[PDB]
Amino acid sequence: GIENIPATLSHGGRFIQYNIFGNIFEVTAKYKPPIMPIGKGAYGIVCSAMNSETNESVAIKKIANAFDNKIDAKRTLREIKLLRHMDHENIVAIRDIIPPPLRNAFNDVYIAYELMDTDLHQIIRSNQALSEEHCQYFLYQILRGLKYIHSANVLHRDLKPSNLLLNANCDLKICDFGLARVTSEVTRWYRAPELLLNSSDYTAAIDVWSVGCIFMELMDRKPLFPGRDHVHQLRLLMELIGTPSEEELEFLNENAKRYIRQLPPYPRQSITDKFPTVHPLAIDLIEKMLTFDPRRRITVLDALAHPYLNSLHDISDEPECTIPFNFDFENHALSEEQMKELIYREALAFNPEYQQ
Numbered sequence: 093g094i095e096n097i098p099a100t101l102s103h104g105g106r107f108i109q110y111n112i113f114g115n116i117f118e119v120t121a122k123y124k125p126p127i128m129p130i131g132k133g134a135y136g137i138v139c140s141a142m143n144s145e146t147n148e149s150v151a152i153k154k155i156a157n158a159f160d161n162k163i164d165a166k167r168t169l170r171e172i173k174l175l176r177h178m179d180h181e182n183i184v185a186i187r188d189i190i191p192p193p194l195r196n197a198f199n200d201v202y203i204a205y206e207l208m209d210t211d212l213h214q215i216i217r218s219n220q221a222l223s224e225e226h227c228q229y230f231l232y233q234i235l236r237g238l239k240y241i242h243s244a245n246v247l248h249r250d251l252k253p254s255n256l257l258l259n260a261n262c263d264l265k266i267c268d269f270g271l272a273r274v275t276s277e278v279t280r281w282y283r284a285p286e287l288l289l290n291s292s293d294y295t296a297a298i299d300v301w302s303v304g305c306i307f308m309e310l311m312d313r314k315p316l317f318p319g320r321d322h323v324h325q326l327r328l329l330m331e332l333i334g335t336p337s338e339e340e341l342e343f344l345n346e347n348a349k350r351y352i353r354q355l356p357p358y359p360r361q362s363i364t365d366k367f368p369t370v371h372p373l374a375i376d377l378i379e380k381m382l383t384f385d386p387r388r389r390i391t392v393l394d395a396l397a398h399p400y401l402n403s404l405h406d407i408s409d410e411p412e413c414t415i416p417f418n419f420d421f422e423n424h425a426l427s428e429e430q431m432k433e434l435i436y437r438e439a440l441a442f443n444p445e446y447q448q
Contacts, residue, residue, distance in 0.1 A: 182237025208257035243412035251302035304381030334360030
C-alpha cells in the first residue's frame with residue numbers, strides 16, 4: 093500500500109515524514125515506505141515498518157511530547173532502560189531508538205520494537221477458539237517471563253491481556269514496563285488485593301494475582317472481576333473467593349485491616365461450579381493463584397511446576413537474569429534535559445552514523 097500515506101524526505105534526506113491523518117510521523121530514512129498504522133492510544137500511535145538495511149520488520153511507537161511532564165519522561169526512560177537491560181524470549185525487545193533530527197528540538201520519542209501480530213486482549217475480543225495446548229503455552233510463557241523479570245528484582249506492576257503480545261507461532265512476549273517497581277519507591281480488574289488495600293510494600297505475588305485473573309479471562313472469555321467502582325472490586329473479589337479470616341488478614345495496614353471487618357460476610361463460591369467448562373488442573377492452579385493472603389499465594393517458581401504445565405515445565409530451560417537492575421540511571425534526581433540526554437545517547441548507540 094505504498095503512496096497511500098504521503099512520505100516526504102526531510103532533513104537532507106536522512107528522515108522521512110509520514111502524514112497520518114494530520115499526525116506527522118517522522119522516522120529515519122532507512123524505514124522506507126510503506127508503513128502500516130497498527131495501534132493508537134495515549135502514548136501516540138504505533139506503525140509497522142521495514143528496515144531496508146536489515147530486511148527486518150519493526151513496530152515504531154511514537155511517544156509525542158515525551159519530556160513535557162517529568163513523570164512521563166521518567167516512565168519513558170525507565171521503559172527504555174528496563175527493556176534494554178533484559179534479553180528473554182517472553183520479553184518484548186527494543187530493535188531501535190530513533191535519533192532526533194535536531195537535538196535542541198527533541199520532543200517526540202520513537203521507539204522501535206520487534207513486530208508482533210496481535211495481543212491477548214484482541215484474541216479475547218475477537219471471540220476465537222484456542223486448543224487447550226495453546227492456552228497451556230500462553231500461561232507457561234507468561235510465567236516463564238515473570239520468572240526472569242522478578243529474578244532481575246523488577247515487578248511488572250500492570251499486567252493486562254493487552255500487555256501480552258502474540259504471534260501466529262503462539263510466541264507470547266510481555267511488554268509495557270512503564271510502571272514497574274525496583275522495591276525502592278489504569279484499570280484494576282487485574283490489581284491484587286494488597287494493592288487496593290495499601291500494604292506499602294508488596295512482593296511478586298501481585299503479578300501472580302493478575303496472571304490468575306488473565307488466565308481465567310482466557311479460559312472463560314469474560315472479565316473475571318469487572319469493577320463498577322474502586323470499592324466494588326473487593327466486593328466481587330470476596331463474593332467469589334470468600335472474606336478472609338485474619339489468619340490471612342494479618343499483613344495489610346491496620347487502617348485497611350479494620351476495612352475488611354467492616355462489611356457483611358461473603359461465602360467462598362466454588363470456581364469448579366461457576367466456571368465448569370475448563371479443565372480441572374487449570375481450575376486447581378487458578379484457585380492456588382488467587383489466594384487473598386500474599387504469603388499464601390503460589391510463587392511463579394512453583395506455579396511453573398504445577399501439573400497443568402507438566403508437559404512444558406523445565407527448570408533448565410526457564411532461565412534467570414544474572415545481573416540485577418538499578419533504578420538510578422546515572423543519578424537519582426534528573427531534569428528533563430538529563431533524561432533527554434540519556435535517551436539521546438541510546439538512540440546514538442543504535443544509530444552510530446548520527447554521532448559524528
